[PDB]
Amino acid sequence: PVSMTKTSVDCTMYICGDSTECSNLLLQYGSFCTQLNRALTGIAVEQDKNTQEVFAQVKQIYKTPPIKDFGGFNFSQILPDPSKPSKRSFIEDLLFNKVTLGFIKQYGDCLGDDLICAQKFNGLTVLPPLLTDEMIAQYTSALLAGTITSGWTFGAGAALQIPFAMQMAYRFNGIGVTQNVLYENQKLIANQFNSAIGKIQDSLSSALGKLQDVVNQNAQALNTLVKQLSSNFGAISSVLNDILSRLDKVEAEVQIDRLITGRLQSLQTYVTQQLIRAAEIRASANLAATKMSECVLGQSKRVDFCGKGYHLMSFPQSAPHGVVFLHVT
Amino acid sequence: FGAISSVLNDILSRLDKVEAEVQIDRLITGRLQSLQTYVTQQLIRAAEIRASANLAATKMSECVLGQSKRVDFCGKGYHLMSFPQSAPHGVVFLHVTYVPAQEKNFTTAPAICHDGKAHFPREGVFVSNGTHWFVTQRNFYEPQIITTDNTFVSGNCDVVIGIVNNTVYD
Amino acid sequence: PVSMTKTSVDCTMYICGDSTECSNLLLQYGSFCTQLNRALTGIAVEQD
Amino acid sequence: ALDPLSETKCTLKSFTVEKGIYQTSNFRVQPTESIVRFPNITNLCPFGEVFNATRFASVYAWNRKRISNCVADYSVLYNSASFSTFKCYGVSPTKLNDLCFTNVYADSFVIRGDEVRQIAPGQTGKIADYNYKLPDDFTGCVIAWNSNNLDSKVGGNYNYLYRLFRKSNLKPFERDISTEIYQAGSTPCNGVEGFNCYFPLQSYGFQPTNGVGYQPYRVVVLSFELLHAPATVCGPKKSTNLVKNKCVNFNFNGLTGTGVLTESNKKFLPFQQFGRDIADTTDAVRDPQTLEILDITPCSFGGVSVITPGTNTSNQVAVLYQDVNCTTWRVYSTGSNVFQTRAGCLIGAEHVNNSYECDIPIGAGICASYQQSIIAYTMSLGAENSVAYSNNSIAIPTNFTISVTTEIL
Numbered sequence: 007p008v009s010m011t012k013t014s015v016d017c018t019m020y021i022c023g024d025s026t027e028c029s030n031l032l033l034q035y036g037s038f039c040t041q042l043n044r045a046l047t048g049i050a051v052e053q054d055k056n057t058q059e060v061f062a063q064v065k066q067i068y069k070t071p072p073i074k075d076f077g078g079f080n081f082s083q084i085l086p087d088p089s090k091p092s093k094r095s096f097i098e099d100l101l102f103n104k105v106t107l108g109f110i111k112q113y114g115d116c117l118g119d120d121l122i123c124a125q126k127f128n129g130l131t132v133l134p135p136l137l138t139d140e141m142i143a144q145y146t147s148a149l150l151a152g153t154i155t156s157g158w159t160f161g162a163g164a165a166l167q168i169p170f171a172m173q174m175a176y177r178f179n180g181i182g183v184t185q186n187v188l189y190e191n192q193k194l195i196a197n198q199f200n201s202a203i204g205k206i207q208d209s210l211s212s213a214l215g216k217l218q219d220v221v222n223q224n225a226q227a228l229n230t231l232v233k234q235l236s237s238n239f240g241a242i243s244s245v246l247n248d249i250l251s252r253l254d255k256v257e258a259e260v261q262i263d264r265l266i267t268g269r270l271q272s273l274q275t276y277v278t279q280q281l282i283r284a285a286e287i288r289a290s291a292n293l294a295a296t297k298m299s300e301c302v303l304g305q306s307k308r309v310d311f312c313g314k315g316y317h318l319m320s321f322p323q324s325a326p327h328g329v330v331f332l333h334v335t
Numbered sequence: 336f337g338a339i340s341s342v343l344n345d346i347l348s349r350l351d352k353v354e355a356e357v358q359i360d361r362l363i364t365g366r367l368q369s370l371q372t373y374v375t376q377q378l379i380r381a382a383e384i385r386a387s388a389n390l391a392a393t394k395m396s397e398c399v400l401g402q403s404k405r406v407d408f409c410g411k412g413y414h415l416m417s418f419p420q421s422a423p424h425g426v427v428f429l430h431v432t433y434v435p436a437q438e439k440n441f442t443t444a445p446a447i448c449h450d451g452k453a454h455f456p457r458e459g460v461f462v463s464n465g466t467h468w469f470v471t472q473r474n475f476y477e478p479q480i481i482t483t484d485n486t487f488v489s490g491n492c493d494v495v496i497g498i499v500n501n502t503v504y505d
Numbered sequence: 506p507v508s509m510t511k512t513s514v515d516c517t518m519y520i521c522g523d524s525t526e527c528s529n530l531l532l533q534y535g536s537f538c539t540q541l542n543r544a545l546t547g548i549a550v551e552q553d
Numbered sequence: 554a555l556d557p558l559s560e561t562k563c564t565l566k567s568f569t570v571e572k573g574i575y576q577t578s579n580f581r582v583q584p585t586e587s588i589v590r591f592p593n594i595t596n597l598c599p600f601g602e603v604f605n606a607t608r609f610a611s612v613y614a615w616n617r618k619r620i621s622n623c624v625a626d627y628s629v630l631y632n633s634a635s636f637s638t639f640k641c642y643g644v645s646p647t648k649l650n651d652l653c654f655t656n657v658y659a660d661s662f663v664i665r666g667d668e669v670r671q672i673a674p675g676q677t678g679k680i681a682d683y684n685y686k687l688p689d690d691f692t693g694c695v696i697a698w699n700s701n702n703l704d705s706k707v708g709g710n711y712n713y714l715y716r717l718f719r720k721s722n723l724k725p726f727e728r729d730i731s732t733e734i735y736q737a738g739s740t741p742c743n744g745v746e747g748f749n750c751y752f753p754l755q756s757y758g759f760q761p762t763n764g765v766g767y768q769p770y771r772v773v774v775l776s777f778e779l780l781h782a783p784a785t786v787c788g789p790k791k792s793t794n795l796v797k798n799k800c801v802n803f804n805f806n807g808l809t810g811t812g813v814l815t816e817s818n819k820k821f822l823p824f825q826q827f828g829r830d831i832a833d834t835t836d837a838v839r840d841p842q843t844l845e846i847l848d849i850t851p852c853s854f855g856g857v858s859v860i861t862p863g864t865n866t867s868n869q870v871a872v873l874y875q876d877v878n879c880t881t882w883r884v885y886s887t888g889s890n891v892f893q894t895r896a897g898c899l900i901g902a903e904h905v906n907n908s909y910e911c912d913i914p915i916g917a918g919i920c921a922s923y924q925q926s927i928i929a930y931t932m933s934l935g936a937e938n939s940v941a942y943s944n945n946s947i948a949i950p951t952n953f954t955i956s957v958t959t960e961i962l
């Protein structure tokens with residue numbers, strides 16, 4: 007995982023609704039809403055930085071050639087197909103259709119009647135990301151094309167083309183094997199690679215668990231927030247309009263203050279837990295960026311870092327709120 | 336915090352011991368909450384700072400006291416050296432790196448056939464200006480003459496895809 | 506270090522003891538105990 | 554509350570604002586008029602048959618009476634009645650005129666003055682332990698007034714009785730009218746009264762020359778519920794017409810609020826008047842005249858953001874409405890420029906067909922900048938290079954550069 011969901015809260019609409027009495031009573035506290043929203047804004051700003059640090063290493067958008075005259079290796083399942091509106095890959099599509107779930111939701115649609123409308127009617131807002139899925143796919147295709155046409159040269163300056171088998175020879179020399187092995191078992195090696203990519207495809211056409219955990223956690227949190235509005239916090243009622251309909255200005259202030267206190271506490275707890283989760287996400291994104299720099303733009307000698315075995319190469323693919331690395335060993 | 340005043344001395348000047356305890360307890364509760372929140376956020380920030388400091392120590396050990404082969408760790412390019420400087424509440428690393436500048440194109444071949452034998456470079460690549468064939472190192476054009484000291488033989492010329500005919504010398 | 510100690514809390518026994526009045530008064534809040542224990546359970550699962 | 558920029562300046566507590574984008578309060582809509590809907594009732598409640606009666610009951614056999622289908626206008630008591638004690642418990646008195654009550658029972662009896670303080674939820678004593686008890690969760694009102702000019706006789710009136718000598722304490726709203734001999738000692742009373750076997754009922758004297766504490770008092774206790782059921786009995790407020798598809802303030806049988814009223818597909822069982830959601834908020838209501846179900850929906854909805862180039866260079870701003878599809882209603886103002894990004898309607902910015910880098914992020918690939926006007930554009934990822942890749946060509950360097958960079962931690 008590389009990113010999580012961004013959120014904003016209007017505290018007045020959550021705590022007091024459309025009531026003017028509660029609104030004026032809430033001005034005393036005042037500072038705490040500003041504090042909460044400062045924190046959430048920081049989180050939201052950090053998410054886009056995570057995405058950028060992972061996917062936007064290079065700023066030359068390399069196009070892939072139309073000959074494909076590689077030494078029998080076939081990257082047709084990982085490279086784009088100029089046929090869909092999502093100008094992305096086979097495997098990227100398979101991944102896209104394996105994770106459930108910013109956009110527009112008009113008043114006319116929610117009028118009368120889901121869970122998102124209930125979130126919105128209480129001041130809980132989800133914000134869209136800056137980079138679209140199409141842009142992330144463009145970035146990934148650029149990285150693929152660079153790796154496949156130049157090797158580890160586009161990461162240290164300008165890209166210097168080299169034939170692909172000549173590059174596999176370097177990468178073999180790097181693990182402690184001579185070149186004659188490669189040039190003498192080229193055909194076999196290419197067939198093995200192709201069958202392995204095919205097995206990946208066949209197993210994905212039938213495991214993305216962490217990317218789903220993230221989504222589920224966020225949804226759970228927001229709906230818990232919505233449900234915590236049925237609590238009384240030591241008062242005669244949870245509804246402000248009942249209180250205001252059977253009690254006067256002096257006797258109602260007590261109960262309204264109790265409710266205010268409790269709901270403020272709820273929001274505080276929400277923001278705290280979000281702060282604690284964003285740090286996990288940040289650590290994972292930093293690891294993913296390290297891996298994109300050390301395992302894709304180069305060749306690693308660290309053990310069990312870029313896979314299992316002796317590392318030869320790696321390919322990136324995008325996924326909702328994350329990245330998938332294909333390690334060739 | 337739901338009380339008649341924020342000042343304790345007003346409360347204590349217009350209310351007695353029994354009626355003032357209520358309001359004073361309200362104030363106490365609220366201000367305690369404030370301090371708790373402060374301490375919590377400080378705890379959460381100190382962890383970010385700790386992670387950054389651990390990274391900086393790793394970098395001082397791997398990039399200053401040695402030479403790294405990790406990519407884009409100690410800078411951008413091929414790492415040569417690094418120098419540290421201090422700064423208020425932090426450190427600045429000066430990374431000295433090597434970059435290639437001027438590229439030229441050449442023709443290639445994976446091997447060379449002389450007498451029914453295939454030769455491989457063992458330290459570089461075979462290149463051609465168009466007529467003659469030289470052997471070179473990869474990150475700097477410094478062409479040499481193809482001999483038996485900068486090559487090694489393996490098999491015969493019937494399996495290598497792209498092999499070429501030329502003359503190896505002694 | 507590689508692991509820490511796992512813990513669980515029964516909130517009713519801590520807050521209200523063996524009293525039925527406090528028990529019935531505590532049902533209003535309700536969600537917060539479930540929340541707390543969700544969190545602690547996550548910690549415990551992460552240790553292993 | 555002049556504009557979104559001033560909202561921002563008040564949020565930050567500063568007269569200066571720096572370049573960027575800021576989130577503000579949501580889009581609000583204020584009500585136009587006010588609606589009141591009560592039932593159709595004409596009769597006035599029997600204030601006279603209850604308060605201005607002829608003979609009251611004894612506290613041990615207190616009387617209870619139901620009240621229904623009536624208007625509760627109590628100002629008709631001002632000309633005749635003067636109450637010494639009046640106390641309401643789960644309701645404020647200044648609100649008794651704009652509510653509607655559900656299950657109204659009136660209880661009546663006569664007691665002695667010094668015992669009136671015993672008509673309350675706690676209050677142990679002779680009257681509360683053996684004769685009449687109120688519950689702890691009481692919603693209603695207690696009323697008491699002196700009657701030494703009616704229930705007093707010169708030689709002494711002996712027709713008002715109280716219970717002494719009970720075995721245990723009564724439960725709330727319970728009645729005991731038994732006439733049995735009470736055993737104080739252990740001697741086994743055979744239904745006769747000797748020296749430890751007492752008759753459990755006694756009488757008041759109620760002479761007119763007595764002291765104010767031994768004088769008679771008439772007591773009425775009213776009990777009812779609020780805001781959970783049809784509420785036949787109602788107050789003297791006047792009703793209006795029904796207004797739909799407009800934000801209104803409303804009062805439905807005493808329940809007040811704000812919102813838009815629509816027609817619903819729901820169906821209520823005859824013992825239902827209100828409907829709640831997961832958060833216990835009222836989302837549906839039956840009309841007390843037409844008997845049709847109406848859905849209630851709030852009015853404030855949708856996020857808003859402000860885009861500013863800095864107050865040191867301009868006071869021009871742009872505004873982003875995140876939940877609008879202007880292609881054009883729920884806006885604070887219209888203008889010359891509208892774009893309709895994927896992150897909402899953008900009002901106050903010119904759209905250009907080029908692509909630069911991101912200065913101010915908006916979202917979904919849209920950034921903004923200040924040129925003089927404000928422009929919005931799809932942002933740029935970088936340039937194209939198109940490596941060659943022949944199968945026999947190689948590129949090799951012939952020189953190098955020494956670079957020095959900084960990294961700060």
Ligand SMILES: CCCCC/C=C\C/C=C\CCCCCCCC(=O)O
Nearest residue numbers: 667668670671676677678679680681
């Ligand atoms: C001789 C005094 C002994 C007191 C013993 C100590 C504590 C007992 C406390 C209170 C008992 C007196 C209650 C008198 C009121 C009776 C009830 C009533 O009619 O309202």
Ligand SMILES: *[C@@H]1O[C@H](CO)[C@@H](O)[C@H](O)[C@H]1NC(C)=O
Nearest residue numbers: 074078079080081082083200
């Ligand atoms: C790559 O695989 C696909 C389907 O297996 C197909 O395009 C072809 O077999 C390969 N590409 C070639 C051989 O050009």
Ligand SMILES: *[C@@H]1O[C@H](CO)[C@@H](O)[C@H](O)[C@H]1NC(C)=O
Nearest residue numbers: 437438439440941946948949
């Ligand atoms: C290598 O050849 C390509 C193909 O013509 C050419 O465009 C490119 O400029 C060459 N590279 C250099 C360094 O000249």
Ligand SMILES: *[C@@H]1O[C@H](CO)[C@@H](O)[C@H](O)[C@H]1NC(C)=O
Nearest residue numbers: 600601605629630632633634
């Ligand atoms: C109540 O009855 C008294 C006794 O005659 C009378 O004076 C008074 O007017 C009555 N109150 C009402 C309801 O008018």
Ligand SMILES: *[C@@H]1O[C@H](CO)[C@@H](O)[C@H](O)[C@H]1NC(C)=O
Nearest residue numbers: 109110878879880894895896
């Ligand atoms: C708004 O409605 C239009 C219909 O004209 C639709 O095409 C468009 O996708 C909608 N806007 C968004 C981004 O939801």
